[PDB]
Amino acid sequence: CXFXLPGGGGVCXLXSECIX
Amino acid sequence: CXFXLPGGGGVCXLXSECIX
Amino acid sequence: CXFXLPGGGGVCXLXSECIX
Amino acid sequence: CXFXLPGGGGVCXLXSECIX
Amino acid sequence: CXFXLPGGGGVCXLXSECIX
Amino acid sequence: CXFXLPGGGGVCXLXSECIX
Structure with missing residues (x-):
């Protein structure tokens, strides 16, 4: 995280x- | 979660x- | 669409x- | 658009x- | 959070x- | 595009x- 950076x-x- | 699985x-x- | 509703x-x- | 900017x-x- | 809601x-x- | 693939x-x- 954050969103876009798993x-x-x-x-x-x-x-x-x-999903996963 | 994750994103796309509430x-x-x-x-x-x-x-x-x-939002929620 | 919109985003979330294909x-x-x-x-x-x-x-x-x-992706896909 | 883009994502974040309706x-x-x-x-x-x-x-x-x-949704909406 | 959640998604869409800082x-x-x-x-x-x-x-x-x-990003952040 | 699609979402995730700029x-x-x-x-x-x-x-x-x-945003951006």
Whole structure:
């Protein structure tokens, strides 16, 4: 976090911070 | 959560986890 | 659309209007 | 648009360009 | 938070809960 | 686009495709 900067990196919107 | 999966279901973007 | 309500009613954030 | 800036003004995430 | 609601009346998408 | 994939690359949620 914050939104656009997912924990662990990678694509924002794809994975645990999003659906996952 | 995460983004696009509201904890109480229904409409994502709609309810506690969004505005609410 | 709008944001959160894809046309045809799929999950918001999952598919071409998002990543896809 | 873009995301955060609804085209007709007002509050991002609240109104026709979001749910509405 | 939640998504779209900084919590103090500010602009969603601008500050710590977004980039920051 | 879609949401999460800004044109030109770059961070999603920052610059013209978001606020900007």
